[PDB]
Each structure stands twice: as C-alpha cells, then as structure tokens.
Amino acid sequence: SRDRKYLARLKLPPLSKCEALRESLDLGFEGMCLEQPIGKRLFQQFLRTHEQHGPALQLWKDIEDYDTADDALRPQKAQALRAAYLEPQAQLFCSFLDAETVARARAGAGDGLFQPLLRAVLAHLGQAPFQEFLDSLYFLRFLQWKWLEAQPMGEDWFLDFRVLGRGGFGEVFACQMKATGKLYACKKLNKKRLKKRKGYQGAMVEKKILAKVHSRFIVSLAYAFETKTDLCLVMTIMNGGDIRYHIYNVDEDNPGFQEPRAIFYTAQIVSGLEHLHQRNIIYRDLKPENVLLDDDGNVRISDLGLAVELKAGQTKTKGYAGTPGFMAPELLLGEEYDFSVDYFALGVTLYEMIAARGPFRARGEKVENKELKQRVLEQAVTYPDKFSPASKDFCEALLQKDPEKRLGFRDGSCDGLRTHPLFRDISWRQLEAGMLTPPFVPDSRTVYAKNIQDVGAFSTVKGVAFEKADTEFFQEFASGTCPIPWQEEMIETGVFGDLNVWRP
Amino acid sequence: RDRKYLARLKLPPLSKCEALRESLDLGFEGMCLEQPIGKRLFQQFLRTHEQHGPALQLWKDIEDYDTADDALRPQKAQALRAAYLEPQAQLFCSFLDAETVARARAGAGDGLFQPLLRAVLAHLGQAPFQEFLDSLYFLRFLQWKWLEAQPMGEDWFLDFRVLGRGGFGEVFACQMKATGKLYACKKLNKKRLKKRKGYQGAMVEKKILAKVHSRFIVSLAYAFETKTDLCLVMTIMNGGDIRYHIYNVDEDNPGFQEPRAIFYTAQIVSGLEHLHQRNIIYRDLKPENVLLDDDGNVRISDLGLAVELKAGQTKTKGYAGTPGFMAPELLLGEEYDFSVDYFALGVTLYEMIAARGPFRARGEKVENKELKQRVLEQAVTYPDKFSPASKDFCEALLQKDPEKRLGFRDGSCDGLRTHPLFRDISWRQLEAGMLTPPFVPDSRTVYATVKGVAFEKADTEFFQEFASGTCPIPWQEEMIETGVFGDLNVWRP
Ligand SMILES: Fc1ccc([C@@H]2CCNC[C@H]2COc2ccc3c(c2)OCO3)cc1
Ligand SMILES: Fc1ccc([C@@H]2CCNC[C@H]2COc2ccc3c(c2)OCO3)cc1
Ligand SMILES: [Cl-]
Ligand SMILES: [Cl-]
After folding, report:
1. β pairing state of A221-226 and A230-235
2. What angle do CA B149, B155, B158 make, to 5 degrees?
3. Are residues A338 and A282 in contact, defined by beta-carbon separation less than 8 angstroms?
4. How many Å apart are CA B467 and CA B202, to the nearest integer?
5. Which candidate, A16, A10, A65, A66, places its Cα nearest to that of A38?
6. Is there a contact between A48 and B139 if contact means CB atoms under 8 Å apart?
7. Which reactions does this protein catalyse (chain A)?
8. Residue B171's closest CA among B264, B106, B99, B235?
C-alpha cells in the first residue's frame, strides 16, 4: 500500500539545488558505488550503457550470482563464467584483467574461488570507469537522490498500527513509511522517563552504533527523529518475538530448544558479533531477551545501548555493565576486557537455549548480586543430559573463566570458532547470505509478546522540566535519515524505478 | 552503418562541454523548437514532469493535425478539442486564456490551431524552459552539441556514383559511413577555382546554404576540404534537373502537361519565398538549377550567384545570371531586388510548358545584344498550349517594369499563391511535402587539366574559412532519422 500525498513529496530536485551537496560529498569509490545501493545501481546503469565496460559489469554480476548460488548450481556457473569472461576469444573476455588473475580464476574449486577475481574487477572499476562515472549524468542523478535522501522525514511520515514489545523506557511499534509502504519497527523512548533515570548516554550510543553498522544479523537503523514526547528509532521490523519468549512461553511444557535450532541461532548470533568485533565494537548485552526473530525465523541482535566502540590504539575497555549472570569474570573482577565478554554471554545464552535456566542459578532462584558474582567467578558449571558432547564442549569453551583461554575473536575473525564441531553441519556461506531455511518459522496470526491487557502501567513523570542542554541533546539525537537503509527502501518499494526516469 | 566510424559517435564527458556551455548563446526558439535534438530532449523533459503533460500533448497533437491527410482531420480536430479545450477536459490547459480556447473550439480551415500553438509555445518558453535548463536533459543537449562540432571530414564519406559534372567540379552520390545516410557531395577543384577566380561564388553558396532550411532548397550538411577539393555535402537529388525532363524524357513530346508545370512552380515559389524572407536574391533561377529527388519533389540549387542584402539595404547592383533569364532592370544596369527572381520564374514556367524560351525560337542562337534587345523591348507571345491562367501568370511575372511585376510583398508570396493558376494546389500539403508529385523518377534511369597554380597563405586561409564543418539542424536530423540518436539516448537497458 501507499499514501499519495507523502509519495508526492518524493521528487527529484533541479540540479542547481545539488551544488552544495556536491562540494561536501565524500567521493570515495567504495562508499559511493559499492556500499550505497542507489550509487551502485546508477554506477551499473552507467556501465551498462558504455559498451567497453560490459565485460567488467557482467563479470561483476556473475560473481555475485555465483556467491549466492545453491551448492548444486555452482560448478556449472563457474564453468559458464570462465567460458564467458576468461576465454580470450569470448565475446565478453575481460582483457583489462592481469593474465595472472585470469589464469588463477580458471583453476580450482575451493571455497575461495573468484574472491581474488572480484577484488581485481572492483579495483579496475574503481579507477578509470569510476572517473568516467563522475563525469557523467549518472553521477548527477546520484546527487539528486542524495538531495532527496537528506530532506525532512520525521514522525508525520510514519503510521503506527500495533505494539511489538515494551519495557520500562518505552514501546516498540510496527509502523508504515507512508510514502513507500515499507513496514518498519519504531522504538519510542520517552523523554521524561529518560531524563529522570539518566538514560541519555544509552539512547545516543545505540543510535550511533545502529546507524553505522549494516549487517543482516543486527537490527538496522533507517531513521532517527524526535517528537514532543519521544526520541524515535525506526528500524528493521522484527515480528517474531525475542528468544527469551521462545524458550519459556511458547510450548511451556517443553521449555528450551532442540539442539539443531539452538545451533542455528548461535551461528547467526556469532555472525553478528563478528560484524561488530571486526569494527571494534563490544556489544556487552548479549542475552536471549535481546535476540529477536523476524517473520522468516532468522534472528538479529538488538539493544546496543551498552556497547563500546574502541578508538584506534585501544584494545580494551573496562566497567560494570550488562545483566547479572551474563557478565564475564574479567568484567566482574574489574579487569580491562575486549570482545571476550561477548563470547562469555554467548555461552550463557546457548546454555539457556538448551536448558531453560541459567547456568549459575536454579529455576526461579533470586540471589544477592554478591552471591551471584561469586558463583560466576568460582563455581564450575554443570550440564544436564539435554546437552550432547558437542553442545557441552562448546559451552565449556565459551564459559572458560580466563578470557585468554576462551573461544572467540582471533586474527580479525571468528573463523577459528567456526571450526568447532558443534557447527559441523552449518554451511557458513549460505548462512551469511541468508539462504538457509530457518528451523522455526513464526506464525503471522500470532503476537509473540505480553498481552496488552496484562501490561502494568507506569506512573507519570512529574517535574522534569527541559533545560537547554536537554533540547540540544534531543536535536543531536535526531540526525534524521540513514543513507543505506533509505536507498534500500526506495529500490525495494519501486520508488527508485518509478522516479529514475529518462525516456518514458 | 560502418562500425569503425559509428564508434566515433560517442557522447563526451560532461567536463569537455564547459567551453561550449559558456559560449553557447541560444534562446528557447533556437534550442527547443528549431534544433531537432533540443526539441526532442525538451519534449522528453516535459514528458517526465507530469504537470507539463497537457502542454506537451497538445503541442504534439497540433503538429500531428497540421501534417495529417485531409480525411483524418475532422476526427483529429474533434479528439483534440474534447481532450484539451472543452470545459471539463481531462487534459485541460489552464494556462491558456478563454478567448484562445473558445476560438480554437470554433470552425475549420488550415490555420485552425495556429493561434493555439503560438499560445502553447509562448507558455512553454517561460517556466517550463527555465526548468529544462536546470535539468539533465539540457546537459545531454550540450553533449550532443559537442559531438556535433567534432571533425567529420572526407574520411567519413564513401563515394559511389557521379550525379553531375560542371565547370568547376562534380557531384558524387555518397554515404555517411557512420550512419549510412545518403547525400550528394559537390567537389570544387581548388586549382580551377583559383585560376578561374571562383572563390566568391563558392564561399557565397556555402554561407547561404548553411543559413537556409527549406524543403525546397538543397540542404547543406557538411562543408570540408581535402587536398584537391572544396566539398559540400548536401541533400541527395537523384532524379535529374528540369531541363533534362523537359527536353530528353519523351523526346517527341517536349515540355510538361500544365498541372505538372504548376506543381513545380508552386514548389519553386516556396523556395524563393524562403530566400526573399531572409533577404537573399537567388539570381540564377532556371530549369537546369531545379533538381528532382526520388519522390519527384524539386528543390532549387546552385546558389553561387546569390546575394544576401545587408540589414537595411533593400536593393543591389551587379551584372550576373544567365542570358534569357536576366530581368530588364538588371540588363539596364540598375538597382534591383527580389523582383529579378520572379522574372526568371516566368521564363522557367514558360519554358516548362513551351519547351523553348519566350525570347528565342527553337534551337535559336543569338548575339547577346540581339537577346538583350528582345528582353528589354519585345512582348512575349503565347502559343495555344497555354491556358488563360498560365498565360496571365507568365504575363504578370514577365512585366518589364519591376514595379508592376508580380512577386514578393508584405514579407511573403501569399499574394502570388492567390493567382488562379494555383486554384488546385493545396498550399498546406505542398508546404509540408505531402502532395503526391505528378512524375515519380525511376532509379534504374540515369537522368543525367590546370597547370602552374601554386597556393599561398591567403588561399589556404580562404580554404579553412570555407571548411566550417557541420551544420547543426541537418546534422541533428541525420542523427534522429538514422536511429543513432535513439541508440545513444538510453538510460537503463
Ligand atoms: F524501549 C524498549 C522497548 C521494547 C523492548 C523489548 C523488551 C522485550 N525484549 C525485546 C525488546 C526490544 O523489542 C523490540 C521488538 C521488535 C523490534 C525491535 C525491538 O527492534 C526491531 O523490531 C525493550 C526496550
Ligand atoms: F559542380 C557542378 C556539378 C554538376 C552540376 C550540374 C550541371 C547540370 N545541371 C545540374 C547541376 C547540378 O548538379 C547536381 C546534381 C545532383 C545534386 C546536386 C547538384 O545537388 C544535390 O544533388 C553543376 C555544378
Ligand atoms: Cl552521460
Ligand atoms: Cl533532471
């Protein structure tokens, strides 16, 4: 669906309006033509209309097709690619490539196949062809879309229609971007409630981190804005409830998951952790209640309000933050730590997925923080029959008290962690490209949340008048529209194709 | 098409178009109405901005009406009126005033929607045009204007047949290699031109053909030099000249039946009008200079004796032309204007019907002074082959006193188009090239050394001036006609 009044506000500007934007824009190849979907699209259209660039473009497309193809189709696709682009007599022979590069891509069947070739294709495209793009009408059209992207799109642009979750500080709504029809979730954090409980830093950290990360295993931020009452984060719609809910509340007499299902989630969570750790961000809040399912059954991590982004030269942070019983010993002992803490929380998360209780507490046990801290430091975890030898070994490797001994991020990746035999039946390629059929597909009829009639109301916040510092802070927060998700939306909903006209 | 030269037709990077942008001095009329590529890009612009849809479609439908077969007109008028002009019309043009609308809804006739079109184009020339200049479409126009100015000299043209030989040179049938378009190429030998002092005539012809754009005058498309020649690439006229058709087609029956002569006269008149409206006197109208194309439509050619009057100047002097076709005022060494061309039209027409000139008997060669004496002093007689109308028309054109001669008045030949000779000509269809010509030439029919010359600065410089390159309107037409423009105007295949 759509609404035509808001749709009518999506129009491409005159060129003279784009002059300021052109001078202040980052012209990096990677940032413009590879990472930004409208940039990439316009760059490809440019390549498509200039014959000399056809081989490069088509090779690029055919590598991406090979990368995301079923295992059964791959050998044949590799044969066709080779014959089309890497045979010297072929119509679309890629003669710009180094002969060495061509000879290596003609050989082998290993998991690395065509990655080096792709790097050479993109390194070529980044030179003269990109320079021609910049001097073409397709680059100017990109500026028009960037101008449109930067226009005011706050609260009036969204139509809520249902509550998805809520906590102490506000609600998450399923909403609709009125112009395009795209379904999103909107986190509304109440201003007064946040001022009272000193929650500003957390709201800001999450917003910044979600704006700059782009991963299929982490919820994305598409817009950020304020209203009279709230600070609003418009993000990936996740309809399927959180993992805590699916452990305890769904099939109550069978709490916890079968092992294949828990392994799948674990793999998806690992992939999202890795994405953060490669960007030097420590999550610090991994737990079942912050892992969310979408409609297809795939999961994403969420709530980045406690995350730390390391600066260059900094390998560790420090401090008490997170949830009792997901916090690692190094953290509880007051030591500096890196990403290791997230993998300890991964262990606790998996334990709970299989066992339907924490590893440091009995069912329903509520203990003093100091007693819980002692158990985490000193008490060996025990595993019931529900754990297979591989489940158990993996948990043991993550719940290792010494961070140096714990499985995790090494040599810039989680590749070592992936060889653990727990994951022996996971095709990582298809996992990372979102191709694997999930183990549980949520029901469209069903609300995976607390019944609205059973939600405790919160008292009103009295006498928190807003000073200048609050209002200035609200304006910093409301940085508006995030480029990559906004471009994805325009393309997905057909607005791009509709407005990207030339000769109707 | 030849891949090799087709490959050279590539749109430039935008940065290469900066100088052109800076020096280009075009208004709405020059850019979006008169230049076929600007008009096309301007219409493309309008088609993508929904608010300009009514104006764009109305414009196209008027032009569609103007060039429609008479049988299709009642219904085209009907549909246009119901779509744009009637009270709750879906494509109502609110920018028009009510008087313009009411009048366009009333009546029939030829200029039925001319006032309306004038109003549509005046509106489109204001804000819609300004918006166009701030669009990608205008930049694309600059890119085509850049391509238009690139060197396209002799190597771009394949010769394949001789169409005529003259004194100064030859006309070849040729083919633009990149587009495959057929043209005629007139090559004037440099050394003969110098030795016989024909520079003036070559330059004058080139300038004039470059600044005229009529379906009744050979169109100049490219002008360039080679080592041996000055070349003019122009409308291919394959069907022979009128002298040839009068005297050589059916030898036992020379001359044309009257309706055929009148058709050609109407076309000739329209060419003359086009020159006289631009202040040019032709001065060499005669059957040998009027050529037929493949369809049997004619155009005037050989503008080497022409003269363009300076702004303000209304008469000129100078002995030039062909004996028998020169008017008395010219023969008498007086100042003259466009009137000389009309005298020559009378002679031309007379000869089309009579298969001889009005002043000499069949095969009769006379001293120039005996012929001068006749043109100045003798009344022309008319054999029985002339209807009263054609005699009356010839008489009016052959008046010895230019003040009494039928010709060009009030900026046009409308007064002349009114003569009863032309009662069966539909001027609209003629002016538009829709009328089925009376004679259709066959393809299978072939209707048809200098020493001691050394060149200097002054010569090679004259040569370089002459090689001005490509003429915008005919080039743009070529690009559209042959599909090159369409091929290089795609955004997303
Ligand atoms: F302010 C707050 C509101 C709601 C909560 C929820 C409490 C229970 N566990 C999940 C928490 C996050 O809820 C969601 C649900 C769907 C979403 C989403 C986040 O982002 C994309 O789609 C936490 C904080
Ligand atoms: F240099 C010269 C060559 C030939 C002549 C010819 C002499 C006989 N009568 C007509 C003269 C014009 O010849 C043509 C023929 C085809 C044409 C053309 C002109 O222009 C476009 O296609 C004049 C001058
Ligand atoms: Cl371009
Ligand atoms: Cl535009």
Report:
1. antiparallel
2. 115
3. yes
4. 11
5. A10
6. no
7. L-threonyl-[rhodopsin] + ATP = O-phospho-L-threonyl-[rhodopsin] + ADP + H(+); L-seryl-[rhodopsin] + ATP = O-phospho-L-seryl-[rhodopsin] + ADP + H(+)
8. B235
- How far apart are the C-alpha atoms of B221 and B201, rounded to whole Å? 18
Q: Are the CB atoms for B358 and B350 separated by under 8 Å? A: yes
Query: What is the token pair recorded at B89?
Result: 């019309």
A107/A415 Cα distance (integer angstroms): 25
CATH superfamily of B1-149+443-493: Regulator of G-protein Signalling 4, domain 2 (1.10.167.10)
Rounded to whole angstroms, how far apart are CA atoms B345 and B272? Answer: 9
> Using an 8 Å Cβ cutoff, are A66 and A58 in contact?
no
Q: How many residues does chain A have?
A: 504
**Ligand 1 contact, A242 CB (< 6 A):** yes
User: What are the pocket residues of ligand 2 if the criterion is a CB atom closer than 6 Å to any ligand atom?
Assistant: B 163-166, 168-171, 184, 186, 218, 234-237, 241, 288, 291, 301
In the structure encoding, which two tokens stand for residue B376, read together? 């100045």
Interface touch B44/A502, C-beta < 8 Å: yes
Shortest distance, CA B419 to any CA of chain A (angstroms): 48
Its sign, for the CA torsion B461, B467, B468, B469, is negative
Long-range contacts of A486-490 (CB under 8 A, 24+ apart): A486/A149, A486/A222, A486/A223, A487/A36, A487/A37, A487/A38, A487/A39, A487/A145, A487/A149, A488/A37, A489/A177, A489/A180, A489/A182, A489/A222, A490/A10, A490/A38, A490/A145, A490/A180
The answer to whether A439 touches A260, Cβ cutoff 8 Å, is yes
Question: Most B CBs within 10 Å: which of A19, A137, A499, as the mutation test of the B interface?
Answer: A137
Distance of CA A254 to the CA centre of its chain: 31
Looking at residue B179, its amino acid is: T
Task: From the candidates A62, A242, A285, A342, give the one annotated as an active-site residue.
Answer: A285
Beta bridge partners of B291: B241, B299
Question: One-letter amino acid identity for B126?
Answer: Q
A285 is catalytic: yes
Q: Which amino acid is at A26?
A: D
Question: So where are chain A's domains?
Answer: 1-150+444-504, 151-241, 242-443
Q: Do domains A1-150+444-504 and A151-241 have the same CATH topology?
A: no
A45 contacts in B (CB within 8 Å)?
491-492
Q: What is the CATH number of domain B150-240?
A: 3.30.200.20
Nearest to B186 by CA among B156, B216, B239, B225: B225
CB B252 within 8 A of CB B259: no
Mention the CATH class of domain A242-443.
mainly alpha
- Side chain identity at residue A34, one-letter code: L
Resolution, given in Å to one decimal, reads: 2.3
